[PDB]
Ligand SMILES: [Mg+2]
Protein backbone atom coordinates (compact mmCIF):
# COMPACT_ATOMS: atom_id res chain seq x y z
CA UNK A 291 0.00 0.00 0.00
CA UNK A 292 2.86 2.44 -0.94
CA UNK A 293 3.21 3.90 -4.52
CA UNK A 294 5.00 2.02 -7.41
CA UNK A 295 8.19 3.61 -8.85
CA UNK A 296 6.16 5.26 -11.73
CA UNK A 297 3.69 6.70 -9.11
CA UNK A 298 6.68 8.22 -7.13
CA UNK A 299 8.09 10.00 -10.28
CA UNK A 300 4.52 11.34 -11.00
CA UNK A 301 4.31 12.61 -7.35
CA UNK A 302 7.69 14.47 -7.68
CA UNK A 303 6.52 16.12 -10.99
CA UNK A 304 3.23 17.16 -9.21
CA UNK A 305 5.31 19.18 -6.63
CA UNK A 306 5.43 21.87 -9.44
CA UNK A 307 1.55 22.07 -9.43
CA UNK A 308 1.66 25.68 -7.99
CA UNK A 309 4.22 26.84 -10.65
CA UNK A 310 3.78 28.32 -14.17
CA UNK A 311 5.54 25.82 -16.50
CA UNK A 312 4.47 22.43 -14.99
CA UNK A 313 5.74 19.48 -17.08
CA UNK A 314 2.15 18.63 -18.12
CA UNK A 315 3.16 16.41 -21.10
CA UNK A 316 5.44 14.41 -18.76
CA UNK A 317 2.56 14.11 -16.23
CA UNK A 318 0.35 12.83 -19.15
CA UNK A 319 2.92 10.09 -19.93
CA UNK A 320 3.59 9.12 -16.28
CA UNK A 321 -0.15 9.01 -15.32
CA UNK A 322 -1.06 6.61 -18.23
CA UNK A 323 -2.83 9.51 -20.08
CA UNK A 324 -4.61 10.70 -16.84
CA UNK A 325 -3.18 14.25 -16.54
CA UNK A 326 -6.64 15.83 -15.87
CA UNK A 327 -7.59 13.24 -13.19
CA UNK A 328 -4.27 13.46 -11.23
CA UNK A 329 -3.88 17.30 -11.53
CA UNK A 330 -7.57 17.88 -10.49
CA UNK A 331 -7.14 15.41 -7.53
CA UNK A 332 -3.88 17.18 -6.46
CA UNK A 333 -5.55 20.65 -6.69
CA UNK A 334 -8.73 19.48 -4.83
CA UNK A 335 -6.55 18.03 -1.96
CA UNK A 336 -4.24 21.16 -1.89
CA UNK A 337 -7.24 23.60 -1.67
CA UNK A 338 -9.11 21.27 0.80
CA UNK A 339 -12.17 21.20 -1.57
CA UNK A 340 -13.15 17.55 -0.64
CA UNK A 341 -13.60 18.54 3.07
CA UNK A 342 -15.25 21.96 2.35
CA UNK A 343 -17.88 20.55 -0.11
CA UNK A 344 -18.07 17.01 1.47
CA UNK A 345 -17.04 15.31 -1.82
CA UNK A 346 -16.47 11.54 -1.36
CA UNK A 347 -12.97 10.83 -2.79
CA UNK A 348 -14.24 7.73 -4.78
CA UNK A 349 -17.01 9.93 -6.36
CA UNK A 350 -14.37 12.58 -7.29
CA UNK A 351 -12.06 9.98 -8.92
CA UNK A 352 -15.00 8.29 -10.77
CA UNK A 353 -16.25 11.66 -12.14
CA UNK A 354 -12.70 12.83 -13.10
CA UNK A 355 -11.94 9.56 -14.97
CA UNK A 356 -15.38 9.81 -16.71
CA UNK A 357 -14.78 13.50 -17.67
CA UNK A 358 -11.24 12.67 -18.96
CA UNK A 359 -12.63 9.70 -21.02
CA UNK A 360 -14.99 12.19 -22.86
CA UNK A 361 -11.97 14.19 -24.13
CA UNK A 362 -10.93 12.67 -27.54
CA UNK A 363 -7.45 10.99 -27.51
CA UNK A 364 -7.28 11.36 -31.39
CA UNK A 365 -7.58 15.24 -31.21
CA UNK A 366 -4.08 16.79 -31.12
CA UNK A 367 -4.81 20.05 -29.17
CA UNK A 368 -8.37 20.10 -27.62
CA UNK A 369 -7.80 16.98 -25.47
CA UNK A 370 -7.43 16.02 -21.77
CA UNK A 371 -3.84 17.41 -21.70
CA UNK A 372 -5.14 20.90 -22.72
CA UNK A 373 -7.96 20.59 -20.09
CA UNK A 374 -5.33 19.63 -17.45
CA UNK A 375 -3.12 22.59 -18.54
CA UNK A 376 -5.98 25.15 -18.30
CA UNK A 377 -7.00 23.74 -14.84
CA UNK A 378 -3.39 24.02 -13.50
CA UNK A 379 -2.93 27.53 -15.07
CA UNK A 380 -6.28 28.72 -13.54
CA UNK A 381 -5.06 27.24 -10.18
CA UNK A 382 -1.83 29.35 -10.36
CA UNK A 383 -3.72 32.55 -11.44
CA UNK A 384 -6.16 32.09 -8.46
CA UNK A 385 -3.11 32.07 -6.05
CA UNK A 386 -1.86 35.49 -7.39
CA UNK A 387 -1.01 37.84 -4.44
CA UNK A 388 -3.32 40.67 -5.74
CA UNK A 389 -6.32 38.20 -5.37
CA UNK A 390 -5.44 36.75 -1.87
CA UNK A 391 -8.71 36.21 0.14
CA UNK A 392 -10.86 37.87 -2.65
CA UNK A 393 -12.78 34.74 -3.86
CA UNK A 394 -15.00 32.32 -1.86
CA UNK A 395 -14.44 28.51 -1.85
CA UNK A 396 -17.56 28.24 -4.13
CA UNK A 397 -16.10 30.75 -6.70
CA UNK A 398 -12.71 28.85 -6.63
CA UNK A 399 -14.62 25.51 -7.18
CA UNK A 400 -16.51 27.14 -10.10
CA UNK A 401 -13.31 28.47 -11.83
CA UNK A 402 -11.49 25.09 -11.49
CA UNK A 403 -14.53 22.90 -12.45
CA UNK A 404 -15.22 25.25 -15.42
CA UNK A 405 -11.55 24.90 -16.54
CA UNK A 406 -11.79 21.06 -16.32
CA UNK A 407 -15.01 20.77 -18.46
CA UNK A 408 -14.42 23.78 -20.76
CA UNK A 409 -13.52 21.75 -23.94
CA UNK A 410 -14.97 18.27 -23.07
CA UNK A 411 -16.04 16.16 -26.13
CA UNK A 412 -14.31 18.66 -28.54
CA UNK A 413 -14.32 17.08 -32.05
CA UNK A 414 -11.18 19.00 -33.22
CA UNK A 415 -13.04 21.36 -35.65
CA UNK A 416 -14.32 24.97 -35.14
CA UNK A 417 -17.87 26.30 -34.55
CA UNK A 418 -17.83 27.63 -38.16
CA UNK A 419 -17.00 24.13 -39.55
CA UNK A 420 -19.92 22.59 -37.51
CA UNK A 421 -22.28 25.38 -38.75
CA UNK A 422 -21.23 25.13 -42.47
CA UNK A 423 -21.62 21.32 -42.48
CA UNK A 424 -25.16 21.53 -40.97
CA UNK A 425 -23.99 19.30 -38.03
CA UNK A 426 -26.51 18.05 -35.40
CA UNK A 427 -24.62 20.12 -32.69
CA UNK A 428 -25.08 23.36 -34.74
CA UNK A 429 -28.84 22.47 -35.14
CA UNK A 430 -29.31 21.89 -31.43
CA UNK A 431 -27.60 25.13 -30.35
CA UNK A 432 -28.97 27.34 -33.20
CA UNK A 433 -25.41 28.05 -34.51
CA UNK A 434 -24.68 30.08 -31.28
CA UNK A 435 -21.52 29.18 -29.19
CA UNK A 436 -22.13 25.61 -30.46
CA UNK A 437 -19.04 23.90 -28.93
CA UNK A 438 -19.14 25.92 -25.65
CA UNK A 439 -22.87 25.01 -25.07
CA UNK A 440 -21.93 21.35 -25.80
CA UNK A 441 -18.91 21.36 -23.39
CA UNK A 442 -21.18 22.62 -20.55
CA UNK A 443 -24.03 20.15 -21.35
CA UNK A 444 -21.63 17.14 -21.32
CA UNK A 445 -19.72 18.31 -18.20
CA UNK A 446 -23.02 18.55 -16.22
CA UNK A 447 -24.67 15.42 -17.78
CA UNK A 448 -21.67 13.26 -16.69
CA UNK A 449 -22.58 14.05 -12.99
CA UNK A 450 -25.54 11.61 -13.49
CA UNK A 451 -23.33 8.53 -14.28
CA UNK A 452 -22.88 5.85 -11.53
CA UNK A 453 -21.12 7.41 -8.45
CA UNK A 454 -20.22 10.63 -10.42
CA UNK A 455 -22.27 13.37 -8.59
CA UNK A 456 -19.38 15.30 -6.92
CA UNK A 457 -21.92 18.05 -5.87
CA UNK A 458 -24.32 15.56 -4.11
CA UNK A 459 -23.75 17.23 -0.64
CA UNK A 460 -24.07 20.91 -1.77
CA UNK A 461 -27.30 22.77 -0.86
CA UNK A 462 -29.64 23.82 -3.71
CA UNK A 463 -28.41 27.46 -3.14
CA UNK A 464 -24.73 26.35 -3.54
CA UNK A 465 -25.60 24.28 -6.69
CA UNK A 466 -27.58 27.14 -8.37
CA UNK A 467 -24.72 29.65 -7.69
CA UNK A 468 -21.96 27.17 -8.83
CA UNK A 469 -23.95 26.29 -11.98
CA UNK A 470 -24.57 29.93 -13.01
CA UNK A 471 -20.84 30.78 -12.52
CA UNK A 472 -19.59 27.67 -14.44
CA UNK A 473 -21.96 28.50 -17.35
CA UNK A 474 -20.88 32.23 -17.39
CA UNK A 475 -17.16 31.16 -17.36
CA UNK A 476 -17.33 28.47 -20.12
CA UNK A 477 -19.52 30.58 -22.52
CA UNK A 478 -16.81 33.32 -22.09
CA UNK A 479 -14.22 30.86 -23.67
CA UNK A 480 -15.88 31.40 -27.12
CA UNK A 481 -13.30 33.60 -28.99
CA UNK A 482 -16.27 35.56 -30.52
CA UNK A 483 -16.66 37.06 -26.95
CA UNK A 484 -12.91 38.02 -26.62
CA UNK A 485 -13.18 41.75 -27.66
CA UNK A 486 -16.14 42.41 -25.23
CA UNK A 487 -14.36 40.55 -22.33
CA UNK A 488 -11.14 42.58 -22.93
CA UNK A 489 -13.04 45.96 -23.15
CA UNK A 490 -14.76 45.10 -19.78
CA UNK A 491 -11.38 44.07 -18.20
CA UNK A 492 -9.76 47.38 -19.47
CA UNK A 493 -12.76 49.38 -18.03
CA UNK A 494 -12.17 47.54 -14.68
CA UNK A 495 -8.39 48.41 -14.70
CA UNK A 496 -9.22 52.16 -15.30
CA UNK A 497 -11.75 52.19 -12.31
CA UNK A 498 -9.65 49.66 -10.24
CA UNK A 499 -10.05 49.87 -6.42
CA UNK A 500 -7.73 48.19 -3.83
CA UNK A 501 -8.33 47.76 -0.05
CA UNK A 502 -5.84 49.30 2.50
CA UNK A 503 -4.37 45.70 2.50
CA UNK A 504 -3.40 46.27 -1.22
CA UNK A 505 -5.72 43.51 -2.65
CA UNK A 506 -8.34 43.92 -5.45
CA UNK A 507 -11.87 45.14 -4.38
CA UNK A 508 -14.81 43.34 -6.15
CA UNK A 509 -18.14 44.01 -4.32
CA UNK A 510 -20.78 42.94 -6.97
CA UNK A 511 -21.40 39.67 -8.95
CA UNK A 512 -20.87 41.48 -12.31
CA UNK A 513 -17.24 42.44 -11.34
CA UNK A 514 -16.39 39.11 -9.59
CA UNK A 515 -17.60 36.95 -12.57
CA UNK A 516 -15.87 39.27 -15.15
CA UNK A 517 -12.52 38.62 -13.35
CA UNK A 518 -13.13 34.81 -13.19
CA UNK A 519 -14.17 34.82 -16.91
CA UNK A 520 -10.96 36.74 -17.90
CA UNK A 521 -8.85 34.51 -15.58
CA UNK A 522 -10.01 31.25 -17.33
CA UNK A 523 -9.81 33.03 -20.76
CA UNK A 524 -6.14 33.92 -19.83
CA UNK A 525 -5.53 30.25 -18.79
CA UNK A 526 -7.04 29.12 -22.16
CA UNK A 527 -4.70 31.56 -24.06
CA UNK A 528 -1.64 30.87 -21.78
CA UNK A 529 0.45 28.67 -24.21
CA UNK A 530 2.60 31.60 -25.51
CA UNK A 531 3.34 32.71 -21.86
CA UNK A 532 4.93 29.31 -21.00
CA UNK A 533 8.61 28.30 -21.30
CA UNK A 534 9.35 27.89 -25.04
CA UNK A 535 9.74 24.01 -24.94
CA UNK A 536 6.06 23.86 -23.79
CA UNK A 537 4.74 26.63 -26.12
CA UNK A 538 6.33 24.86 -29.14
CA UNK A 539 4.60 21.54 -28.26
CA UNK A 540 1.21 23.37 -28.05
CA UNK A 541 1.91 25.15 -31.39
CA UNK A 542 2.72 21.76 -33.08
CA UNK A 543 -0.57 20.35 -31.66
CA UNK A 544 -2.87 23.30 -32.65
CA UNK A 545 -1.31 23.38 -36.19
CA UNK A 546 -1.83 19.55 -36.56
CA UNK A 547 -5.51 20.06 -35.55
CA UNK A 548 -6.04 23.15 -37.83
CA UNK A 549 -4.33 21.39 -40.83
CA UNK A 550 -6.57 18.29 -40.27
CA UNK A 551 -9.64 20.64 -40.37
CA UNK A 552 -8.13 22.24 -43.53
CA UNK A 553 -7.76 18.73 -45.11
CA UNK A 554 -11.42 17.92 -44.24
CA UNK A 555 -12.50 21.32 -45.73
CA UNK A 556 -10.39 20.83 -48.97
CA UNK A 557 -11.58 17.17 -49.56
CA UNK A 558 -15.21 18.50 -49.39
CA UNK A 559 -14.51 21.59 -51.59
CA UNK A 560 -15.33 24.01 -48.68
CA UNK A 561 -13.33 27.27 -48.36
CA UNK A 562 -10.20 26.48 -46.22
CA UNK A 563 -10.35 28.39 -42.87
CA UNK A 564 -7.53 30.82 -41.85
CA UNK A 565 -4.26 29.06 -40.69
CA UNK A 566 -5.77 25.64 -41.76
CA UNK A 567 -4.02 25.39 -45.22
CA UNK A 568 -0.84 23.21 -44.75
CA UNK A 569 0.18 24.18 -48.39
CA UNK A 570 -0.20 27.96 -47.64
CA UNK A 571 0.88 28.38 -43.94
CA UNK A 572 3.34 30.65 -42.05
CA UNK A 573 3.29 29.01 -38.55
CA UNK A 574 5.80 31.68 -37.26
CA UNK A 575 3.97 34.72 -38.74
CA UNK A 576 0.62 33.28 -37.40
CA UNK A 577 2.03 33.01 -33.80
CA UNK A 578 3.41 36.61 -33.98
CA UNK A 579 -0.05 37.76 -35.24
CA UNK A 580 -1.87 35.78 -32.48
CA UNK A 581 0.43 37.29 -29.80
CA UNK A 582 0.28 40.90 -31.20
CA UNK A 583 -3.54 41.11 -31.75
CA UNK A 584 -5.00 38.63 -29.12
CA UNK A 585 -2.65 37.22 -26.44
CA UNK A 586 -0.42 40.28 -25.60
CA UNK A 587 -3.34 42.79 -25.34
CA UNK A 588 -5.16 40.34 -22.96
CA UNK A 589 -2.13 39.47 -20.75
CA UNK A 590 -0.96 43.17 -20.72
CA UNK A 591 -4.43 44.09 -19.32
CA UNK A 592 -4.39 41.14 -16.82
CA UNK A 593 -0.82 42.20 -15.70
CA UNK A 594 -2.17 45.77 -15.00
CA UNK A 595 -5.09 44.33 -12.92
CA UNK A 596 -2.73 42.29 -10.65
CA UNK A 597 0.39 44.60 -10.99
CA UNK A 598 3.11 43.50 -10.48
CA UNK A 599 2.27 39.76 -9.95
CA UNK A 600 2.24 38.86 -13.71
CA UNK A 601 5.55 40.62 -14.76
CA UNK A 602 7.53 37.30 -15.32
CA UNK A 603 4.59 35.83 -17.36
CA UNK A 604 4.41 39.02 -19.54
CA UNK A 605 8.29 38.89 -19.89
CA UNK A 606 8.18 35.22 -21.08
CA UNK A 607 5.42 36.21 -23.60
CA UNK A 608 7.56 39.08 -25.07
CA UNK A 609 10.64 36.72 -25.26
CA UNK A 610 8.55 33.99 -27.04
CA UNK A 611 7.19 36.70 -29.42
CA UNK A 612 10.80 37.84 -30.38
CA UNK A 613 11.88 34.18 -30.84
CA UNK A 614 9.01 33.51 -33.38
CA UNK A 615 9.72 36.91 -35.14
CA UNK A 616 13.45 35.94 -35.49
CA UNK A 617 12.47 32.62 -37.29
CA UNK A 618 10.18 34.18 -40.01
CA UNK A 619 11.40 32.96 -43.48
MG1 LIG B 1 -12.94 26.02 -26.29
Ligand SMILES: [Zn+2]
Pocket residue numbers: 372376408409479526
Ligand atom coordinates in the same frame (compact mmCIF):
# COMPACT_ATOMS: atom_id res chain seq x y z
ZN1 LIG C 1 -9.59 25.53 -24.44
